Amino acid sequence: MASPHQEPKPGDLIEIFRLGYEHWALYIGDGYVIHLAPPSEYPGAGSSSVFSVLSNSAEVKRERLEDVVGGCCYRVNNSLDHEYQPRPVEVIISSAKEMVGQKMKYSIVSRNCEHFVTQLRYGKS
């Protein structure tokens, strides 16, 4: 018979279901993922501004899948295979690793973690 649950492999797009929202990550093997940490409204927080409250930012990071998902549910969902060519998975993971340590802007980025993990396969070249 077939397996009762999914298991992630190198290059897989991880789809994570939080309370009332969804989030995404790039799985790299050995239980690890690469992901974008979400930003906030901090420099424009209510009743304050850049002189009275500090800034914030998003950052590409590497962690364990378990640590990243926490109490949230998750699945493997490689939807972009229908959109783009079969790119060489070592270069998608190398792109993820090259992106780790890079920053992105404030709250105004909106839904952006799927757009980030999209660019790892779409912008391979």
Catalytic residue among 5, 82, 113, 115: 113
d(CA 93, CA 11): 7
Catalytic residue among 23, 72, 73, 82: 23
CA atoms within 13 A on the CB side of 104: 21
Contact (CB, 8 A) for 8 and 26: no
Domains, the chain, with CATH or none: 1-125 (3.90.1720.10)
> Gap positions in the chain, given as the residue before each gap (C–N > 2.5 A)?
none
If you ran DSSP here, which 8-state letter would residue 120 be given? H
Three-class secondary structure of residue 51 per DSSP: coil
Catalytic residue among 35, 72, 73, 115: 35
Experimental technique for the deposited model: NMR
d(CA 32, CA 8): 10
* CA 45 to centroid of chain Cα atoms: 25
Three-class secondary structure of residue 69 per DSSP: helix
Active site residue 82: no
d(CA 57, CA 51): 17
Tally of CB atoms within 10 A around 34: 25
Active site residue 115: no
